[PDB]
Each structure stands twice: as C-alpha cells, then as structure tokens.
Design a protein around this ligand. Sequence first.
Ligand code: NA
Length: 315
Amino acid sequence: SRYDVTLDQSDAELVEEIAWKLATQATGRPDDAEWVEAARNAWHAWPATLRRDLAGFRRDSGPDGAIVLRGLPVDSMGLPPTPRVNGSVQREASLGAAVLLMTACGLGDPGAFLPEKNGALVQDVVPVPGMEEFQGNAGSTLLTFHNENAFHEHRPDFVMLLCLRADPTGRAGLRTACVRRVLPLLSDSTVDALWAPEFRTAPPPSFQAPAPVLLGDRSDPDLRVDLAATEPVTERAAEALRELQAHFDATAVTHRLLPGELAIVDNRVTVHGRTEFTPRYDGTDRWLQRTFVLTDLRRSRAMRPADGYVLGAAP
Ligand code: NA
C-alpha cells in the first residue's frame, strides 16, 4: 500500500544523517524561524522516493485519509523517561523535532496555536497523573473521534504523530476514520442533516454560529466535527451525529504506533481518536510528538504576528 511506507535501509540511514545534522548543527531552537528555515532546507536533502510519497499523499490522501511511514530516526538509546507534566513540549533541538519540522515543511509549513501547548511547534502526547479523564494529550480514557481544533477557521490541514516510545501495556491505539469510507453508508436523512447548518462547535475556554458538518463537494466532502464538543441544534442533527459516530467506529483503522513510526492524518477528511489505557507513570509510558501542518500558511497571516508560525487572534 502506498499509504503504509517502510523506509529501506539506505533511505533510513540518509534521513538519520540529515536529522542528526539538523538537530546538532542548526543555530537556534525549533520554535525559532531560523531553525524552521534549516528544517525546510534539510527536507530537500531527503531521498526523492520519500519526497514523492509525501507529495502523492498531499495530492490525494486516499480512502482512509492517512499515511504511516515506518523506520524514521528516533534516539531510542538517548531517550529520557517519558515526561509526566501537562503542557509538555519540545523547546530544545532534538531528532524528533528535526523529523517533524522537516516533514511539515515538505507538506506545507508547521503551525501552532498560542492558547494550546503555548504555541509550541512540537508538542508531547504523554499521560499525566490526574488528567486521565481529559479529552486531550494528557488523558488515557477513550479519546472520542474529532477533527483537530474543529472550531478553528485555520485548523490543522494535517496532524503528524511521531512515536518515540510505544505504549508498553498494549491497550493504546490511534484510531482514524475517514469520511470517504462512511459517506456511502450513511442514510439519506443523516446525509441531508450533516449538510445543514445545525451543528455548534464552540471554541474551548482557553481560546477566550451553527454550521454544517459536511463541506465542499457532495461526493468527496471535507468535514468539521468533534464528537465531544459539537452540539446538535435540532433532533435530526442529534440523530445524524449518532449515526456518524457509529460508522466512524465501524470503519476506523486502529494503529498501535511503534518507535520511528510517523502517522500523518488528513484533518480535512479524517477524524481521529484513541483507545483507553492504564498508564504506569514510571517513565516507560507511551510518548508521541505532534506537529500540525498548514497547507497554505499565507491564509492565516492576519493571525500570525511578524509572519511567524504561531496563530493567535484576528483581526
Ligand atoms: Na487530536
């Protein structure tokens, strides 16, 4: 499958060399524009095979709206214990930051939101004691299906998750479900409901009108939904969300990520969630790093002071 790519040894070694050079030699640190520039330049040193694979995915993300790359460099011997604080981010140069920011610059540009993880471009996904029930990075209860930052006009176009350390307990898996798999299975009444402006997705409290869930083309729509946050404004809308959830559940691909695996989710067409797990809280738990990609950074300029990578309020 061209949506499941394992790097061959030659390509894996080259990307490792490139990532280490960026991580150790580039001036500044990942959130600095000069480091993102070094990452952009380093991306273009990647093997053509992988650049072609990513370009193909950007053009058409396929029936599941997701790709996984396996065999990317991660510093397993050098990895510290899994962080255990909420809001954990990667401010220092590292191999994980190098891989994520290079790939972001290949697909578009990286971006982040000031009210979420303090606008860091590379964010940790790690379980935190006391946050078990949270619908977010720090939680370990079932994470309900959603588009990332569904409320936001400039929500991520892609969400990238690089696995540093697998969940040792075997119960955690990333779940992705694409509107392309479910649209043909939905009832006419549900489809009609999802095109109507009868859903309210209010911003989270940290970020300080009724609209449709389905967007764009009738046969190949985008979608905008968060099954935790999106509120139906009518009864048919409520029924539509229940049917949509059911079909997401039935058609979702579930992935237990392993070190060196990079999952890239097309957030225009694919929702994601996560199964429940019981953290150990002993430094050995699941550790992903996450970076958002904007396919056209220019569109959010009004929200990006100094033409930076951190989106805040407009106008
Ligand atoms: Na998410």
